[PDB]
Amino acid sequence: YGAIYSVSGPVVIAENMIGCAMYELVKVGHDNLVGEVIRIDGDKATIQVYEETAGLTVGDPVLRTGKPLSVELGPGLMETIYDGIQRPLKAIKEESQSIYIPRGIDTPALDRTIKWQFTPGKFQVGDHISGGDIYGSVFENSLISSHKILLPPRSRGTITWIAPAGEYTLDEKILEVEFDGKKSDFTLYHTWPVRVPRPVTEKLSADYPLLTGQRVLDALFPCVQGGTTCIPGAFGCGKTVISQSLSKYSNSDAIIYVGCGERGNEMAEVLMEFPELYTEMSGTKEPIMKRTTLVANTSNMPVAAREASIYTGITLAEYFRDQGKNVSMIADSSSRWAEALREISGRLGEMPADQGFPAYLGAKLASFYERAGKAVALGSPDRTGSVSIVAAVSPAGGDFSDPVTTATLGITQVFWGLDKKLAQRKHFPSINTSVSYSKYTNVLNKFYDSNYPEFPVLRDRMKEILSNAEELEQVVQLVGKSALSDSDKITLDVATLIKEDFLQQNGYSTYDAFCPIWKTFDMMRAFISYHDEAQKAVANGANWSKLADSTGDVKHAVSSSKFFEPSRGEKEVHGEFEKLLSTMQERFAESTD
Amino acid sequence: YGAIYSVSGPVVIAENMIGCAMYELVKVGHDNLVGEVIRIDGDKATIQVYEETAGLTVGDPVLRTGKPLSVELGPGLMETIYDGIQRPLKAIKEESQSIYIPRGIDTPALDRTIKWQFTPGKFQVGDHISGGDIYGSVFENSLISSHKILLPPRSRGTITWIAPAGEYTLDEKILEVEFDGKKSDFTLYHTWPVRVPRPVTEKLSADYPLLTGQRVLDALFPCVQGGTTCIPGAFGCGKTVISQSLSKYSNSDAIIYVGCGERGNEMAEVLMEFPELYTEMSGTKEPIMKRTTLVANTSNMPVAAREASIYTGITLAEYFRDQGKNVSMIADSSSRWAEALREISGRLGEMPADQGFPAYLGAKLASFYERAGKAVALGSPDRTGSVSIVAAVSPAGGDFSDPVTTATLGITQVFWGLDKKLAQRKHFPSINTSVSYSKYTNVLNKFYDSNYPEFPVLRDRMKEILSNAEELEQVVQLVGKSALSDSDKITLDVATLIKEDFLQQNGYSTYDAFCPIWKTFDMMRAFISYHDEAQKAVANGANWSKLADSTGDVKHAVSSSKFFEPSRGEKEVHGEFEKLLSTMQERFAESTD
Amino acid sequence: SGNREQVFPTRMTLGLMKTKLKGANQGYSLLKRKSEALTKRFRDITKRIDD
Amino acid sequence: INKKAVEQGFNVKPRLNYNTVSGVNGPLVILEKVKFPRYNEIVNLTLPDGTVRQGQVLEIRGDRAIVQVFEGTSGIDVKKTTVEFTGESLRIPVSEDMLGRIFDGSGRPIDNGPKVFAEDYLDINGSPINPYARIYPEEMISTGVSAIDTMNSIARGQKIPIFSASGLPHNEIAAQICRQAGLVRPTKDVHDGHEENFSIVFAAMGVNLETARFFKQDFEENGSLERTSLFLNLANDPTIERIITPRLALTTAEYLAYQTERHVLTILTDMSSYADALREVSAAREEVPGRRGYPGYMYTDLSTIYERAGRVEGRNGSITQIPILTMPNDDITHPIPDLTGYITEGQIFVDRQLHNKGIYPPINVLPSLSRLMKSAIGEGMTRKDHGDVSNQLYAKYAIGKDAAAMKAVVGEEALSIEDKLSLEFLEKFEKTFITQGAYEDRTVFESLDQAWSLLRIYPKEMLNRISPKILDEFYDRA
Amino acid sequence: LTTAEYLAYQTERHVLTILTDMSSYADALREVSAAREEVPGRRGYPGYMYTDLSTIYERAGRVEGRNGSITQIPILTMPNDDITHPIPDLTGYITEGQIFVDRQLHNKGIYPPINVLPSLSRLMKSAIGEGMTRKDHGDVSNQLYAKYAIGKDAAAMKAVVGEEALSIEDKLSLEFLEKFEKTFITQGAYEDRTVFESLDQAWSLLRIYPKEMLNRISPKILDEFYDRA
Amino acid sequence: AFIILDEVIKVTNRRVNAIEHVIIPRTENTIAYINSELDELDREEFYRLKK
């Protein structure tokens, strides 16, 4: 149809575009570069191009697909890795047979030539079907044994023909729904515009923790299945490793790992690592890559595609929410999405808001984060999914006041603010306990009282003594340890113990790669009991200076309590912790005689 | 030719102005104001007039010149005083008797009336010639005996007519060469686009010291002829000694003093001093003004003149380099030139990028300093020259953090670092030895090992004892002087002797106005040997006080060593220093008993 | 870079913290000279107590 | 066998020679009646004098092309200027014969030799590597530098820069690393070392003559110019041209590594000068400034320079990358160091304070970081104790800095016993572990032996980071 | 606000109109007026923000002849926590007073985390005194404000300079500030402290100081209330 | 006087080490980084208006 009229970086103006609609996919150039209309100046329609724009000339035809950016949901969507435009990368490397992505390569998003075993659902011929109803299940892979195929929303009617059990490709007709006289026929895959969230029946309240296997994140600043978590932090501060640990160790029946704007290696090592790593939720050691979809769009990949990547990832996660899987989308840096928005807007030369970012950044981030939340899936049979967006915020210069962080805050219920100063001394996961918060501690009390009743009290005690340590250090770095009382000294020593042995977690060693919730709770009891016994012994008369060397074995036992291998089993580890508690109490009773 | 179409402050938009390249000086108005084409659009070029545009009128002819801002190189340039854009500030005062500079005055940059004696070189008629070939020498003045003229670097061909020996003015068509049949005549002078460096055959590595004559500069913090330099140009620090010693005593065969926007009275002081500074060698009575040109600018000179001041200075310096003369600029207050750049950028609307300075401030400073360097002149005969830029920096408020001073400190190898406190204590030359680093100490080993072998280790020892005393003054402040060991007291006494009688140079007396490199080296040997003999005879002998009182005559001798007359002859002075060292050794041997 | 004060950057804050820097600087100089006076007296006391 | 012949570039393309230069401003020159302009095309401006500046179309609008001239627009006229639209994006002529040739900043040989008799005309800023096709770089490269090997280990393929400030010896450290780099457990493909050595692609951009000739000399002194292809772009060379020098060096590195299978370093010295050139070309177009005046596309552009590095699935090559760069005020939060720390695989920090004490290298091991260390250390590669020794050294160095500050504040007496221990550890650290001769080579094993003999200052009890098994196996005398 | 106006003025009903997250309103206004290519204000916000925020705010207050009234408490997510951001800075102009919910008090666990000194009510002065609430309300409020400010200054000095330099007044003020933030500002989510028992707590708090040191309290109020205990 | 001199000396040292050298970076931030950045943004907006 219309021809090019301007190519100013990732922004292309196309003339003769009289029928174009805002946000409508529009193929560009002779090799069909993908792009979205974003403005109209008459018949001229400013369009982003989601691929490397170098080499477009005035006059290159631009087609109007007449449909917004659609992501092909369905089977075969889970194990693989996608570019930001929902194109598989394994298929690209097998097609072009070259280590680069060709510009304009048109690969069907899902493999159309894999015969998926299909088992028809409860609905039969004549049963009224509504948007979101599950009409069958496909054995996608071992871990996702029942990938419930569901009717796409915005489509209803009465089933006229259904496909019996068997195996089908993604193009074979599965059922035919009659609405009015129109008889639409559906297949395994169904497209969906990413710009609009997948509808849900109702959005419940997130009240089951996203056990992220990290000690400080699990204990002091928990996140909830359906909660929205941001991890602002300077470069080299642990955002990506925290995200990867949360992806490969949390309790979440699916993972969408959207790497919009990171180095390719932190996405190649995910492919290298996940298959050799196993889980236990299904009841058998099965590789975790069976459940995680990588939506990769590295930094040097076309910048306009970062936004498309973040939206494709959130729509994939929301789809797996419609099946009941407690998916947890993991944006690797929402800041690079904001960078893409800034670069596009500045290329349009319009609305420089705070720090050059576009004005609408707050609205887009709010809508994106609100696309999360544990909700009852649409239609029937009834099922409750959850999308919990964890998104590193990567502020420029490490400044918390950087506008993408400030916009991200106020909409994210959890804020694991990382600190560069702690990450410099290799104090993992480098979270800053002073300013981090989690608005989800108030709703988790039900789970805690159901499972670990004295967890919240211990968390409050730990944060209290940590804050006491912070103010005491503020005093000491100006006055010195002389003016400290003895209780102040014990608070400082116990807080140093915590900051070096509980909050810290190597993240890669076999013993602290995944600290399960029961071990974390046990160590909270151990550390707080050590502090309580030491405080009591100091109160009962024994000066802590003498006590330090006499009970040094107990303090070292507490410090080495983090080496208790999590794979040893709950019974073994809890028995070891009860032994440690008893030894603590007896030795502190003996030493105060 | 073209007519003025618009005027707005200084900018002036010509019309029907086809054929004017960017940055081409165009004479504006009936008064022939000089402006440069800063932006050309279609057939109209936005001229940026230098002088005040208070009188311009639509329709006033603007006449092209076809040359970018070009200095006018040639004989007669040795002695005169120039403004930013090379308008002779003496001829302007002489032909237009008024104290002021009339708008649009156009006195030739070089005196046309003076008749120069010219003796042709080895190039006969028919000899092929190339850019930079010395085709004749002109006796400019008694201190520049042979101002070897040379063909412009962008000209070449066969000599068709060469003028015989005789007296010629600058318009006498000295030489006519032929290239592609197109004859081109050459006069005694040639012009050169100021903003492009005069090319060289090969730019060597500068490794011969620029003997400023000051003891501390040549001894501890050397600068290499061909190398750069930075100076705190703040008032009262003592910049006068640096500038006058560079222009009066250093081995540079020419000096290009360039003052950018310096306060009017500062330039008045400089223009009254320089005529009355005399050179003791190369004759006896020749004033330095016979070999230095001054690019002077009061702060109210047109902003473009201040912005091009250092450029015209460096092009004159490159000219005198191409003749084989180790010319050495002294750029006074480069920060005012950075201010001129800031104004040009802001007025042009170019977006500020660092504390208001334009984006290209760093690139411009790097290039301008890169035009330094000992270089082999273009063409033949192949004499080598060298340009040294001793460029002072005087930030806005003495902050020494604005990007101009940071860039100069990053680029300039040696930073002699004057100080106000050292000047209030009347400790001239007021060099602050704590911060005055010099990265030319390493490349100068090739010179030292040739003919002053012990100099590098000697200055390393002197600097380390000086730094040790600077550190130990803090210990003396903390605790009483007696708490210092004997060796520490030796270090303090010797470094006080250093600060009083080696660094502290009178500069006005006849004995130490010019401290030659051999005398400086011999004094260095004497002082370091004094410290070494005291250190040894105390580490293996009696208390420091007893030796110091017993050998006070030796300390007086090494202190009075500053008084040895450099005019006495290098051999006689070296023999005297050897006598002093021998008497030293025997006196310490005696007092050791 | 360096120890921040985690303050909210605005012109009133710049002026306030500039005055605070001036106060702390004069306080450092003042307490340093008080310390030299007291350490002078202290050294006199030490020599008299040795005597 | 002859699969390559399918290139067949013998087709000749006549190129239009426009005279219709309309408007010129800054480094931009604007054409008016170009026929079907291409976006990222290359034009050869022919100035009236005869000088041929090479431009690059940067924006098109109908029949208008906003050509931005590399060598500056000074002297560009409207009447006599002619523009020869080449028709194809900027492509360096590439051959594996570059190794040994000292190029200019824009692909023109200045070694007084001939033009490269190019094997292929690879396109600069080539398409990004398919992240599915990447292989995680986890073969450790023993740089020899002790401060870098045992802590902040570099892996073959890492994008690790060298942060520094002007006056620091970043040039010396990079020269040492390049003369000294080799795999910790070499594959011994050629037992004589014929093909064991790293190629080098040096890309001096915006650097003075002294440093460029220093790198030339230092490559000569080590027999490296038989393997090194400099791309020096000196200070006096045009400022816009410093944009394409990194994209020339990285393109030739991609040819020598992925299309030729040679493990190749890459040095991009004064990357802060590239940042300055990018900022200047941006403010020329009035693009929206980023943090401190740099363009909004600063991150993406710097990434496009960097992300062209790392191993590949089916090919034995690998572009190790060491972009030297200068924080202008030794401020790691500046947009030059901050962004390039966000992209690159962690950075080596060369501190000014350490160098002022006189130690060498001045590598401040605390704020440095390396993200491919976590994989390239352990049992199979290096020794089983590498990771925890590194972590413990980090922790004790940080505690030593804290104790030094505490000693400066509250005097030495108030320091506890472990604080004095940690200060002794820090002194011995910065004096006998970070310090290293400019030529001294410490294999990671003897570097670890020094690290253990320097951690043995502490008693076994307060080495919390060390795993108990490794602590039992190594903390003793053997 | 227009439904509130109908409710209060046209049906004589009493209405309390909360407007939550009006910082998002300012964001929406910025988006519209930056897609309009308007001349932007302080931080890219529209120049006319003052008027199109006054039109939102100033539709409040009672009216002669109508029994209705529109109280309104627009929550305002001031960004980066600096009052001089143009949204809170342009709201402090229009709205008489503001309740400043303060972060570092929240970090210490106080609820509600209301910070008194930046908090204000530019018409608190008329809804107090005799005949409406307790007689001593106006002076007690001033005294609590003054001693809270003194306590914060004493804490700042204690951080900068050792505890020795603090006079007895400063130490008493530190104790008062601790008890203040811990027992008076602190309040349960359902506590519902009536103003009279709030004032009784305020007096039992101020009784830390000697009667000679509550200088902002009028001596009559002192002699009448201080010693009641 | 020994105790007083120790307290005053450590107060002066604490000033010159922590207090002044944290107030100086605070002002350095507040003006040089943030205020200059905000002025730069405002000048960008004004130049867009002018265009």
Ligand SMILES: Nc1ncnc2c1ncn2[C@@H]1O[C@H](COP(=O)(O)OP(=O)(O)O)[C@@H](O)[C@H]1O
């Ligand atoms: N909790 C942790 N466990 C293990 N390694 C960590 C942890 N936190 C940080 N690291 C280390 O620091 C680096 C973290 O990279 P990261 O900062 O996440 O990348 P980004 O800068 O993109 O966020 C990795 O090299 C990792 O080894």
